[PDB]
Design a protein around this ligand. Sequence first.
Ligand SMILES: OC[C@H]1O[C@@](CO)(O[C@H]2O[C@H](CO)[C@@H](O)[C@H](O)[C@H]2O)[C@@H](O)[C@@H]1O
Length: 417
Amino acid sequence: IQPYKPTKATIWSRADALKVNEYDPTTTQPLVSGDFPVMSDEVFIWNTMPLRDIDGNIASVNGWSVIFTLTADRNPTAPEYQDEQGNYDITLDWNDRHGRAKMYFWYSRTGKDWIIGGRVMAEGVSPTAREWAGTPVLLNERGEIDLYYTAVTPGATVVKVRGRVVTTENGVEMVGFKKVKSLFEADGKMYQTESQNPYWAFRDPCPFRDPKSGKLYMLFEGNVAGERGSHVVGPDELGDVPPGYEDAGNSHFQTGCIGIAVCRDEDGDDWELLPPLITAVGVNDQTERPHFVFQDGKYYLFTISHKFTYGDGLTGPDGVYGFVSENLFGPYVPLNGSGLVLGNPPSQPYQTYSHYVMPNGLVTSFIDSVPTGEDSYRIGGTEAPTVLIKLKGAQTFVLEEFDYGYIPPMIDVKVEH
Ligand SMILES: OC[C@H]1O[C@@](CO)(O[C@H]2O[C@H](CO)[C@@H](O)[C@H](O)[C@H]2O)[C@@H](O)[C@@H]1O
């Protein structure tokens, strides 16, 4: 026997979070311009999910780049959104997007200047009221796609639906996305359930083939199992805090984690829940959109979070956080010492969200709210400038800003059926 250290969750501790620097130019997203363009006058988009293979390669099909988006109608004539002076209030319409979210696709031969394709699933196919985020996995040269996503209301369930991409020289269609398959939901012993917490998270599936083992796994956002308010911020969750920083306040209410599941097959059909990879009890309630970059034989695990979901006595920016390990199952250490990879600038703290770090170092995000004066701001619901980062050991560095919604392919796949 060669003994191995057992697998354990990596704790993102309060002491790690005290290192978060909101004023580091190497980990700050470039300022979004108040004059940003808007990709649709009919729909809002936000969370953007590039088509990719199971290994994480961003994929074009017959030269066409393809993105999936969470999407909501714009409702400029809705009486519910007219203010006291009878004028449309975009903020109310934008805030209601989550309750009416659906998957759309878009396409382009340039990786930008996206052409709208419309809804992925026809009316009546989705079993739930909302479609929340996931991953569109291109399977083969027949153009078959498994769309892994979150079916929300009733419950929050990781699901998948099989369909096919078809291209012509004029554009792209998504066909046959007809049968949604339940994969798993929160269990209550490892991941928190709605019964334990009405505000539980269980979302954002990110399937991948492990480059070392070749086995199929899947990341997702969850909360650490247990009744809301029952968790304890003990010595390990506090970590090595300095003198005067021992008070955890009511931070036991913040219980985010990055979960992982394993597949029993190569087809992503039958999944088993594993214990969490990263836990943030006392630190942040929302470790959203977990995803990997594999580089230099290491595992770079990114997650998106909010200023507002930090534990009592802690703060940091909205944006990208992340961790690195030599091994899929850890131990992970926080990137840049704190975990912060790409924070919104404090002057425009909500300019972007739902970032996605691609293996080529490009980070795509959508525009949320951009200030245009002392009291005034613009709503986006459209793609932000892409920005290049470099991963180097346990450091990251912001390098270069690219065009709005720039998502170039890493591979092209020849599709015929
Ligand atoms: O629209 C749901 C989708 O959005 C993400 C990121 O944009 O999470 C956002 O929406 C959640 C539901 O309202 C919020 O709880 C969360 O705070 C917010 O960031 C995804 O994580 C999710 O699939």
